[PDB]
Symmetry: C2
Subunit: 293 residues, 2 copies
């Protein structure tokens, strides 16, 4: 029932406005290009005349924009209207950038919560969606009914930067895993193999890797246990054994003219893990090379 | 029923000997350290006195060793015994190294097949196992009954180097995906978060990435189609959008003191994909940067 303002009418913003309207919230919108609001107005949203009018329409302002610079640019003329309101910014950006935004919000009398939407826009309003939130817990609690309708809110803690830290760490896995599927297909296709023949196998290897990591079995790898305890017991997957394979991938890529930066990064991790004395330890010992000193 | 020689009694070799013995094959073994043969002899294997005697015991010689250099070293004294036999080498190595081994085998009158065991040793002899093979198809066919008992043989073609090319491309996905899970956990734990809290989420992200790639849906990404056709239609996952996220991961890692080589490799792929004019294309357009010219 409580009114909401949403600025940024890309695919995520449109799905959130449709969902919130369907749950009976009055929704005021604003966008750099007003034509994108027209379908939302037909569904019952109100188009604000300016960012100031948009901000003044609700106690809760949700931002879905390309980055935090877009928030500063759009809200520049509305800064004096921010006092007493809560900004929930769902845009992706560097964690320290989001922490600086919390200082700017406070300067203008606004409460600030950062969010990170973990699932695609089609999941908004369903059981599949989930969104990280961080910032003052009392603010999260005050607006939880709205955030619940968007889908699967997960409060992480009262450091504003946590939502984008967790978001970018998830995207760290996503982007790197996806790059490796393309790189592996290139390695094989350089020999003349049809890309369509091998890409499904590279995809199955991702699935198999995830199954192995999640293994149900007591004898299987316990990755979080190794990293949390600092003990990396070498079983049948040691750093020196897997590093040898990393070396063979680099030589295979070098021999076939396939780009080297990705496999050389993996080889660098294994090279330094072995050089630090962890050769007989688990490959998970690369954590001791990667982690903050 | 046909006799087999197996050299290299690490975990994979031991599982293969146990399986082949259980199917009624006479199995002759040899190992650099004879003590590792003792359990296999109790199960019914015969321990050969030398590599020459091992090779002379069977028409089929299976090698399970750390690399191809170990094959040359072990079989040096047995080279004159190789004539008329088939070597199946299941050891991992660079594809061109395996092609050079096919020349050496031919020089000594032996047929040569390369294999790549894709599943862990506990899967040997079961429906879960599968092993790539490459080399002369007539040789594969002549020994297929033995290879069938080892588990899921997959003939790839008559280029000896294919088995290890496919193996290393699978391990390309495996090692890179695993490194990203550790890197992502380090990114979050640098903020003080318990590694045991976040590692399960990084693992779930691998599973989710594999599900997305294998998507059942008609609207979902068709990775193999993009790479095979050379058409990378930009939907909601463009190279410029995902490259911006790659940039944020690099700045987050730089700010928290977490190692940069892996996220900088991903950023390098996206940077060059955008700089080549593919910014509005799918992220899969990085294939045009990675692939052999
Ligand atoms: Cl492991
Ligand atoms: Cl995609
Ligand atoms: N900033
Ligand atoms: N070689
Ligand atoms: Na924007
Ligand atoms: Na060996």
């Amino acid at each position: 029932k409580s009114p909401v303002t949403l600025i940024g009418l890309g695919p995520m913003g449109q799905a959130m406005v449709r969902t919130l309207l369907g749950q009976g919230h009055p929704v005021t919108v604003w966008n750099r290009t007003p034509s994108r609001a027209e379908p939302l107005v037909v569904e019952g949203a109100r188009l604000a005349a300016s960012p100031t009018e948009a901000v003044a329409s609700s106690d809760l302002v949700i931002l879905s924009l390309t980055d935090y610079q877009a928030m500063y640019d759009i809200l520049s003329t509305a800064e004096s209207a921010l006092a007493g309101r809560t900004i929930v910014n769902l845009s992706s950006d560097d964690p320290d950038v989001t922490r600086e935004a919390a200082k700017w919000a406070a300067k203008h009398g606004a409460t600030f919560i950062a969010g990170g939407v973990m699932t695609p826009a089609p999941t908004v309003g369903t059981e599949a969606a989930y969104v990280f939130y961080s910032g003052p817990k009392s603010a999260f609690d005050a607006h939880e009914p709205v955030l619940r309708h968007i889908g699967g809110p997960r409060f992480l803690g009262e450091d504003t930067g946590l939502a984008q830290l967790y978001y970018l760490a998830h995207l760290d896995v996503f982007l790197t895993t996806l790059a490796s599927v393309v790189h592996a297909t290139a390695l094989v296709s350089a020999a003349g193999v049809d890309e369509a023949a091998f890409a499904p196998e590279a995809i199955r290897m991702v699935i198999e890797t995830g199954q192995m990591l999640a293994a149900e079995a007591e004898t299987g790898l316990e990755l979080g246990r190794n990293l949390a305890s600092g003990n990396h017991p070498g079983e049948l997957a040691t750093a020196v054994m897997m590093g040898a394979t990393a070396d063979h991938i680099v030589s295979a890529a070098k021999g076939s003219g396939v780009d080297l930066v990705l496999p050389e990064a993996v080889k660098s991790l294994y090279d330094r893990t072995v050089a630090a004395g962890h050769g007989k330890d688990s490959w998970t010992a690369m954590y001791e090379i990667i982690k903050k000193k």
